[PDB]
Design a protein around this motif. Sequence first.
Motif: not given
Length: 416
Positions: A188-195, A211-219, A254-261
Amino acid sequence: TTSVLIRKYAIGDYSKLLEGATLQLTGDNFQARVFSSNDIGERIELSDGTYTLTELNSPAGYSIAEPITFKVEAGKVYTIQIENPNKEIVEPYSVEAYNDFEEFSVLTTQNYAKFYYAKNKNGSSQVVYCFNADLKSPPDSEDGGKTMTPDFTTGEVKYTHIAGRDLFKYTVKPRDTDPDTFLKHIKKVIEKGYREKGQAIEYSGLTETQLRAATQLAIYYFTDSAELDKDKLKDYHGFGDMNDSTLAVAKILVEYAQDSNPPQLTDLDFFIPNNNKYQSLIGTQWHPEDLVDIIRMEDKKNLTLRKTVTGLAGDRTKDFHFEIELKNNKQELLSQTVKTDKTNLEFKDGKATINLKHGESLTLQGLPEGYSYLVKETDSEGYKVKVNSQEVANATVSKTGITSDETLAFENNKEP
């Protein structure tokens, strides 16, 4: 026929296949054969059926791993009943990944400087992220990934490309405790982060690199339990340079990753380095076309029953009989062969009976963590039964969550 490669890995260090394990492949109905594990995996073309991989012995240091059963059906492979999650490239540690040392783009005042890529089969580069904060980044390249800096001791540092399933085990300090939960978070992190270079950035004011840094830090939130707090990040891998905006986007990921979707991405490339000092890498793309089925076995680094007859009227040649009931970690009954100091013991629906005469003993080996026993000596009539010197009216005892070896010493007293 369907191609499979049997690969033997070492739990917790995947920089090389573990050579020198004696493995045997047995199937229901071909010829069973024995081989030794090699650096690239053993390539076999199999007709449809169910097969078993057993470890006849392991190399000095390791323990025998559990027999792996699998099925080849209609060109596909399954583990036991689910789809073989191990799909890897034929030639391991053959993929280049790199840190682009010249690419420049800031978080606030400083180059981000964590521009990691992996090279696809066709020479394009996919954005990847480090999966292990404290390990080394992929090799510096001064020319966009044509040439890379080799490690001083191990030479070029190349990667095995694999389907990013079963990722939990490559983490050091994960936050989650359930692997599937963990995988769902990473996808989910990768999904909404920088691809992809050039992608639309949905968060206003943020640059691609931000965005890439936010993505990496979310991982890292999930892989290394990074905390998403301005002040706790002041000195954490360059992330003090991350502005408020960007960090706010990291919390969104991170919040996205965490939700139930559920994750919208089905699968992701993952890349393991051929040097354990180097971090593994979670990809942003998916290339199933480069992968074949692997049967993976992973190597890692007892209950005893006895009878003594006591008293002058105790018979010392009587086969006393025990009915042993065993369940696993999650209260399921064991339906497996269990090796012992005498012969094997087929447990059906968690049960087997055994006979012991006075001063004999049987030792069940390889019983799993957090197991439980219920043991009854069925033919006690006439004897005062004591287990480990305790009086048992019903000649039956139990214990749950055995974290160590255990010994049940039955004493039968027929005193005149």
